Structure 1
Amino acid sequence: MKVLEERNAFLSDYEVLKFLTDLEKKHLWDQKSLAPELQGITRNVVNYLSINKNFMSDESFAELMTKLNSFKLFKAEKLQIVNQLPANMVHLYSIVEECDARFDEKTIEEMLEIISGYA
């Protein structure tokens, strides 16, 4: 047990459900058998992250903020706004700092258009 790297990469929330769906596949007919600890915990994680989207193709989610890379270096927040209160710009004000005085263009409504494209 040795730790080599802690933050080796960043994975989108799509593959959190996409690889799990394959792991739900080879798991002997889950969720429909009404008539291991991985049997219990993966129940609670498959109906938590996709709920905000619910109450799809990967090529749409791969090209959301590729055209919306209107930054210089501070672009690590492109991954985090994927399911954070869609179709609202009053919630994006408390997420990112110093954008009340930097983004005063149509980009602040273009962030509204990208966030309303999928919802």
Structure 2
Amino acid sequence: MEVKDANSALLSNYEVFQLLTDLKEQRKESGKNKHSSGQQNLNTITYETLKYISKTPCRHQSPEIVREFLTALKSHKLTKAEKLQLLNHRPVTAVEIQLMVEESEERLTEEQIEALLHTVTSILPA
């Protein structure tokens, strides 16, 4: 097959969660479970993926809160890719902030670090 663009439209994990939640609830109602292994592969992939996502504490956030938190973090500098790299997991600890950005010692200060820390703790629930 032919590919137009190899790396394109970088998405998030909650988008995959939301896409896979409604994909299987309508598949079991419509599908006849006709092709055993062909459907089994998709079922296994989706089940393992949704399990890994549900173990990740990022499923309790609807898109409007995501948009609000992203617009709030857009303020200072941080990074286009490190934006969703920081949103992929919970930055509650100050050590994970130092590992998110490969160099977080000379760019900004730690007070602005705890600021965004509490900003994020006010966003995501537990």
**Which band: TM-score by shorter chain?**
0.7 to 0.9
TM-score, normalization: structure 1?
0.80
Name 1:71's counterpart in structure 2.
77
Decide whether the 8 Å contact of 1:93 with 1:99 is kept in 2: yes
Partners of 1:94 and 1:78 in 2: CA distance: 13
CA RMSD between the two structures:
2.0
**CA 1:4–1:83 in structure 2 vs 1: closer, same or farther (change >3 Å)?**
closer
Q: CA deviation at 1:105?
A: 5.3
TM-score, normalization: structure 2?
0.76
Name 1:50's counterpart in structure 2.
54
Partners of 1:116 and 1:103 in 2: CA distance: 20
Name 1:116's counterpart in structure 2.
121
Structure 1 residues without counterparts, runs of 5 or longer = 30-35
Partners of 1:75 and 1:39 in 2: CA distance: 33
Question: May I ask how many residue pairs the two structures share in their alignment?
Answer: 111
Decide whether the 8 Å contact of 2:92 with 2:117 is kept in 1: yes
Partners of 2:12 and 2:28 in 1: CA distance: 26
Percent identity of equivalent pairs = 35
Partners of 1:100 and 1:15 in 2: CA distance: 32
Name 2:10's counterpart in structure 1.
10
Name 1:32's counterpart in structure 2.
none
Structure 2 residues without counterparts, runs of 5 or longer = 30-38
